[model samples]
Target: EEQTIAEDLVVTKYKMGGDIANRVLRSLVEASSSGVSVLSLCEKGDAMIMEETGKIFKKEKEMKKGIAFPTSISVNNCVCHFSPLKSDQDYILKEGDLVKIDLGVHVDGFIANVAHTFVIGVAQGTQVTGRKADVIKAAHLCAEAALRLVKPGNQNTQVTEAWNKVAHSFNCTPIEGMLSHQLKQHVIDGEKTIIQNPTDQQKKDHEKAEFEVHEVYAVDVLVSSGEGKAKDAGQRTTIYKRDPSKQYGLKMKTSRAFFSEVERRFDAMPFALRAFEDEKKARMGVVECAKHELLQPFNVLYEREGEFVAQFKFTVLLMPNGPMRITSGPFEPDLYKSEMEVQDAELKALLQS
Candidate 1:
């Protein structure tokens, strides 16, 4: 539905890619409407975002032609997005889980995408079920609160602070990010919008421009465990695109040969040290493999137990004075949204519509 955002912007663009975007959003709606998780609802959902971004450039007039940009995907606890072949084991999403889906695609001069967090269990975690309904309410309301402040003449701080007020009603908190981005057509950072924290100076100029017809945004809100702030779960498992440093020259040479002959032959991930554990021991590098075993794709951290995370999001296009949520349709019955048993029936009906 939109151009691919730059690498830095993918954290927000992946949410608007359409296909996987729909899947993730639909999953969230289903979880709130029925009794499921975003992870479970996506079991058979189409990864349309990946597909669209791949072909987006080809359809654009600027680029003569281009192939799909390689997409990298990751989830909560599992951060970022990277493609693993069919044989790779899929994470078994469970109840009380916090899932994030991140991906990237490119269209010549543009790339569009983003990521979001979703809670699997009731409330925010395993023992937090009674307020499941309120949790969903909080997530959407927080998103709305932020969206309401997206127009011209608004201060970033004003929007950041609104999240807490809305979240409190549902017994939740908004994760640190208040204002994370101010995007452009082909780039992500030319004009900066620092996250609105206490120490940061306000960027009043950002809102000076009137909302254009095509101006897009990847707005998000993260509802945390009422317990407290979220903590880093541990190390990540993902590796980056290509390394230019010669520091690992020798290791790279050996790894290239070894990976080509072994990893590729067996369809294993490049950094999959566990698969070569026995070989490493034989080569007197057991400790090296052990250390690499802890390296993950992205810095996404997760709590092994004790808490959970939930989120609500949408990619929007600003018009004359309002916005349109792009990642919506009847792709799923619940994609638009609905009520939970604990919600006030009158309010729920009004909201779900």
Candidate 2:
């Protein structure tokens, strides 16, 4: 059976999932401010997703409708995936700190994801300036350009080029090797992807693909004020998703226990270690599963100290008419004042549209 938007019901589920995702994301942004605890924010977002998803599809007794991707609050130099465990150190958001919130919701396994970046306490009149403003502006523009360019007739390569040009316009850089994945039912990462700022070898390794009608994409843009090379600074990876195709027999009793919990709680969707009852025990269990390739980790990556990274992601569906974006944040463009704008004539016109 073709599960694409060819059926009207699938489209309805996607829009419903996106509606919940947008609502929770809006609330999370409103609650984010100076002196806020990152851990609590993460918990708040995830809890709200659960609460919101539970309200819909009451008749479907067995439908899985909850988080497709766990809420992650990455700040400042942290590039992405910063959801923290109880045992992990918590970051207190300060005034003017750059914060990124990425999250997703699913109704009956249809996913809608969204992410937004902003400087703490910066709004309308008190606009963010300097590199923070530059990176945020560039990233937002890249996202907007992708919105228009990633339609049925476009190639994934077009998005790749536009992101590179947009990031360069602000003298910033798109994080190297970052991808915008084509999404499908119960799968966050599909085969088709748009790679940003790839290196020579990476360019060759990435496949060239074209966008088609009825395709869904989680178009993510990550830009940095420094070199866009994201490095894992030994921060423990708390977010992971099971590889359903990989068959691995757990040897350790603890591993077996943890694996079963993961399979039951979160089918293939990414989950944070904080969700487990005992973080330490879960951590030990994950090591064996991860080593055996039964799990895929979403590592917490970082830029250099004192550097800032900005990210904007949205889930969009390519309908017969055009691309319809399902998720978006309350991004006030006036809050970000960049000294540079898209200089390429073609890009300037594209942004205008």
Candidate 3:
């Protein structure tokens, strides 16, 4: 067993963090209705995670717990990492807009992350059809098959190939170059990973690895109705995680002060620029750190306008029994009825299993 990531307490800790993540995920989805503010929802979800995680492991007074990844709600063509600063232009939710909610929680450095997609203002008797429904349903099943494929003994390449077929059957595409990272105690990006739609020399030379028991992963899957090429779209990159391997010295007082705060509070987890009290100082502080490679920014990416995209992400534990998915929203199979479904015989058997 790997000394750090495997322990009974760790398993229970993962589940404990996962419960709150799942709870907050369901709450956010229900509250995502017509006329709600995207900024408001993102902020509220972060607060909710902090408050709920505060209640657990009271005896370990020094334990760190709460948002492992900050709350992000990217809608329509926005691919991911769209948590915004108050000064940034905000968008209001409207009917028929496809919304993707991504967030994560950690109990004493154990992380449980999730993302869910739903269309706004749909009534009970109705079903979402067309490209939106096709993408959503395909993305959902891509994640569904992953639960089976990412277990012990299976290689990461199997999951990759399966995703392409599932997305293709619905006439959708996998968001290229996006990857799911393995999760360790305080490490969000571990050594092993599963990638989506790799090209170039990567097509033939990609590394392959088998899953093993007690390993944990935050499996991310994204399906797009567009070409799946995510662009910068000129949006500010607000989400960042400190890269511990990189080093730099800072002369700016505000930058030094902010770095100390980040070290003490977030350690190595991803955080949003919008979380700090003073946006002006925070913005100034982050520039020096990021430019020097001390911080890695998670950019807010976008797809082509008028083309819809959907995202489904969940964290899983490779238990002896199978892959135990801990964090995600409840899936209502009836809500999204696509004219397309997985047609491949082999892939359908995997989904059935």
Q: Which lDDT tens digits does candidate 2 get at residues 196-242?
A: 99999999999999998899999999999999999998788989999
Q: Candidate 1: where is the Cα deviation over 4 Å? A: 1-20, 23-50, 54-90, 95-106, 109-111, 114-131, 177-179, 188-191, 194-215, 237-298, 328-353
Which regions of candidate 3 fall more than 4 Å away from where they truly are? 1-5
User: lDDT values of the candidates?
Assistant: 0.41, 0.92, 0.90
| Clash totals in order | 33, 0, 0
* Candidates sorted by lDDT, best first: 2, 3, 1
Model 2 lDDT, residue 270, Cα: 95
- The model with the greatest lDDT is 2
Model 3: pairs clashing at backbone N, Cα or C within 3 Å = none
Runs with alpha carbons beyond 4 Å of true place in candidate 2? none
**What tens-digit string does per-residue lDDT give for candidate 1 at 1-353?**
44423243543443434454455444443443223333333322324433444554355554321111222323332323333323344455466544544332223323334445444444422233344335545666666655666655555566665655666656666554334444444433214342422223334334423333445555655565454344454343323222112123225444445434432322221222223435443223322332354211223344224444455445555555565555432221122132333234433343344
Model 2's alpha-carbon lDDT is 0.92
Tens-place lDDT per residue, model 3, 1-353, is 34344678888989999999999999999998999999999999999999999899999988999899999999999999999899999779999999999999998889999999999999989898889999999999999989889998888999999999999999999988888888888888888888898876665766788888889999999889989999898889999999999878898899999999999889999999887999999999998999898999999899999988898899999988878888888788889888888899988888889
Tell me how candidate 3 scores on lDDT. 0.90
> lDDT, candidate 3, residue 152?
87
Ranking by TM-score: 2, 3, 1
Cα TM-score per model? 0.53, 0.98, 0.97
